[PDB]
Amino acid sequence: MPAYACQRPTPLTHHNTGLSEALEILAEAAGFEGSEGRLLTFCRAASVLKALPSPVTTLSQLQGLPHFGEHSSRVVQELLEHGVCEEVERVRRSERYQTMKLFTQIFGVGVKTADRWYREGLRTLDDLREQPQKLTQQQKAGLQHHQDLSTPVLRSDVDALQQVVEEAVGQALPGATVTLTGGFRRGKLQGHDVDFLITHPKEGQEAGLLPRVMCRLQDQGLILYHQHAFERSFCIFRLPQPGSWKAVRVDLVVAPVSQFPFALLGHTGSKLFQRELRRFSRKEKGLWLNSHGLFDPEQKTFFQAASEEDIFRHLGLEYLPPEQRNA
DNA sequence: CGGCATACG
DNA sequence: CGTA
DNA sequence: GCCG
Ligand SMILES: O=c1ccn([C@@H]2O[C@H](COP(=O)(O)NP(=O)(O)OP(=O)(O)O)[C@@H](O)[C@H]2O)c(=O)[nH]1
Ligand SMILES: [Cl-]
Ligand SMILES: [Cl-]
Ligand SMILES: [Mg+2]
Ligand SMILES: [Mg+2]
Ligand code: NA
Numbered sequence: 001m002p003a004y005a006c007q008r009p010t011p012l013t014h015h016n017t018g019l020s021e022a023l024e025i026l027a028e029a030a031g032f033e034g035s036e037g038r039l040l041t042f043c044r045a046a047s048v049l050k051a052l053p054s055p056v057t058t059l060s061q062l063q064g065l066p067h068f069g070e071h072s073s074r075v076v077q078e079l080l081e082h083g084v085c086e087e088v089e090r091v092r093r094s095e096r097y098q099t100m101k102l103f104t105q106i107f108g109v110g111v112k113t114a115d116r117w118y119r120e121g122l123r124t125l126d127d128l129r130e131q132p133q134k135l136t137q138q139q140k141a142g143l144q145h146h147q148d149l150s151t152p153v154l155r156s157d158v159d160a161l162q163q164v165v166e167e168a169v170g171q172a173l174p175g176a177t178v179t180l181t182g183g184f185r186r187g188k189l190q191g192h193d194v195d196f197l198i199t200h201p202k203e204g205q206e207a208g209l210l211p212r213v214m215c216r217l218q219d220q221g222l223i224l225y226h227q228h229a230f231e232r233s234f235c236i237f238r239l240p241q242p243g244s245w246k247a248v249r250v251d252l253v254v255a256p257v258s259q260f261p262f263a264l265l266g267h268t269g270s271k272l273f274q275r276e277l278r279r280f281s282r283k284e285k286g287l288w289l290n291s292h293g294l295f296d297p298e299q300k301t302f303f304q305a306a307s308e309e310d311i312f313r314h315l316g317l318e319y320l321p322p323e324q325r326n327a
Numbered sequence: 328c329g330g331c332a333t334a335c336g
Numbered sequence: 337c338g339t340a
Numbered sequence: 341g342c343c344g
Contacts (some may be wrong), residue, residue, distance in 0.1 A: 066342085109338085110339085136337090153340095232334090234339055253335095272335075279330090289332085324332085
């Protein structure tokens with residue numbers, strides 16, 4: 001079992017679901033408290049279990065697994081012996097965890113904002129609605145749409161949204177393409193949003209594209225919220241439903257075709273997979289990876305990539321299709 | 328002990 | 337600060 | 341919290 005998540009296949013569904021979910025609760029709580037390092041260890045330990053080929057049934061099967069020390073091993077031990085981990089249950093029912101979870105789930109609210117509100121005494125969504133002067137326009141949108149945004153987006157919804165995005169993109173710039181990225185590209189059957197990556201096969205033709213796309217979607221009445229030159233937009237879209245509609249989060253990203261493999265990789269995830277890949281690149285290979293490129297700081301050169309396959313080869317990693325990046 | 332991904336709006 |  |  002290699003130590004970095006990008007060094008091993010991680011399927012979407014696996015054999016240690018309950019154990020990984022418990023560790024991810026502790027990871028989430030660590031983030032709510034600002035402990036990025038402990039969040040990372042708990043996330044990595046959880047991910048290790050996702051990569052295993054069968055269920056963990058005895059503590060000894062953790063020996064030698066990366067990222068399992070005393071704490072994560074005790075969590076697993078208690079789940080195996082008693083079906084529950086007291087530390088995990090205590091977090092789950094704590095007022096602090098439940099409210100930070102509720103607040104950070106709002107579009108436009110991060111840990112630092114939720115925490116300040118928590119310390120001011122706020123606990124519910126209606127508490128926030130009662131004092132709307134203290135909310136950004138983005139948080140106002142997130143709060144208004146919060147119920148719909150809390151509803152999973154279905155793979156069945158994605159096809160309809162991709163077609164209306166393609167229509168607006170095709171008018172904005174003939175020949176531009178729309179690629180589904182994010183969790184659905186990894187095979188997820190449901191998601192918190194839909195993520196698209198837009199490019200054009202003629203380098204440079206994509207310059208200025210996203211405002212043109214956003215203006216056309218807005219003219220069609222499809223945009224309930226967006227932030228407005230730019231290359232990423234975090235939208236709320238009107239998605240038809242029988243007799244009505246629902247609000248859905250949609251992320252649009254534009255990249256030049258030269259950078260498309262890097263942006264596809266970077267936006268296909270998982271989040272942990274990308275963090276680990278970047279960490280692996282920098283710490284093991286001495287190369288700096290982002291959604292634009294891969295930089296050799298000694299040669300002062302960028303790697304040209306024509307595919308995700310190229311990027312894995314550049315880094316000396318076995319290729320992993322998106323469905324095996326569910327770290 | 329230092330490190331923990333990386334960038335855009 | 338928020339977002340991916 | 342864990343790794344190197
Ligand atoms: O902090 C982040 C968030 C997101 N991302 C990258 O952006 C992609 C989409 O970000 P996302 O927030 O849409 N997450 P996703 O994996 O689609 O699952 P879901 O919750 O169902 O939407 C992720 O899969 C990562 O590739 C990061 O690299 N870092
Ligand atoms: Cl990036
Ligand atoms: Cl990007
Ligand atoms: Mg997504
Ligand atoms: Mg997204
Ligand atoms: Na949020």
